[PDB]
Amino acid sequence: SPTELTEMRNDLFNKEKARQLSLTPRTEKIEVKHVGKTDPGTVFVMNKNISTPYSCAMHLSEWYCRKSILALVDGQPWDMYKPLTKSCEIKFLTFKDCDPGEVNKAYWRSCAMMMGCVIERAFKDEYMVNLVRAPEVPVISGAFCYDVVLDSKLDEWMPTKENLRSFTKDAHALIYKDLPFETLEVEAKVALEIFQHSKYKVDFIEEKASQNPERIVKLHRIGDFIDVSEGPLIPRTSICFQYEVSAVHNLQPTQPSLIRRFQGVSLPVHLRAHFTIWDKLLERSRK
């Protein structure tokens, strides 16, 4: 049953979070210097592991909270709700910046994960759905995509326009939920314990641990859904405005198993497009 699996995953996630929170040496203080064009040379004297970049923004203004998508900590991308660890330099990255490449990648990855959650919950109980991964496809491609392995029963099945609309409506419902993008930085063993069922997830965690000097991997939760991520994500689900699941394609080398590539396109509230321009983006994303 899917319900018990997600329940168990949530329990393990919560346990790990509690473990990480417990080892905090009694609200230690860190000095965080803000290095930006705006409000220069302001220092935040904040909690060692409790405090987040979002709470730094909360110290500055509402505008920072609203517009900031990522934090650059020591020149490294960092989630808004990801707790800080050490004394560091912080700046806030928005969509409107001269080089928002990191923000673009973060938004892209976040939308991919949202689509994954949607398509997991979408299918009936009798049918089997297995999520493979979210490939690091560029924004210039026009569509964020996710790889999924379905059951042998739906091999001959192709989704209708109405089915794609249903996925879209589920995604919009998830946007309306306004769920924060919870993050967790764990040792590989914990991730293996969580994702023991899905072999694809096992393999992906293994390679992610391999590329890192340590066995450190990143996990993200929206709501009862946990997924291992390539990099940092956007703060909140509500950031997305225009979200449509474009198309589904069967990958050509279907010798061992059949993998469906789910493709979709999204834009944030900050960068809303007109109806006409949006229609052009849809027609491209279907390819």
Chain residues binding another protein by CB under 8 A are 26-29, 34, 36-47, 51, 55, 57-63, 65, 67, 95-101, 103-104, 107, 139-142, 265, 267-268, 271, 273, 277, 280-281, 284, 287
The minimum distance between CB 238 and another protein, in angstroms, equals: 14
How far is the C-alpha of 136 from the C-alpha of 269, rounded, in Å? 23
Report CA-CA distances (Å) from 46 to 17, 84, 186.
Answer: 20, 9, 23
Tell me whether residue 25 or residue 253 sits nearer to another protein (CB atom).
25
> Which DSSP symbol is given to 154?
G
The minimum distance between CB 17 and another protein, in angstroms, equals: 20
Tell me whether residue 187 or residue 279 sits nearer to another protein (CB atom).
279
Q: 10 Å Cβ neighbour count for 38?
A: 12
Tell me whether residue 200 or residue 241 sits nearer to another protein (CB atom).
241
Tell me whether residue 19 or residue 280 sits nearer to another protein (CB atom).
280
Tell me whether residue 197 or residue 287 sits nearer to another protein (CB atom).
287
The minimum distance between CB 234 and another protein, in angstroms, equals: 11
Structure tokens at 24: 């905090």
Structure tokens at 241: 């405005």
The minimum distance between CB 191 and another protein, in angstroms, equals: 30
Strand order in the sheet with 129-133: 129-133, 144-150, 259-268, 240-250
The minimum distance between CB 138 and another protein, in angstroms, equals: 8
Closest CA to 262 of 167, 183, 173, 186: 167
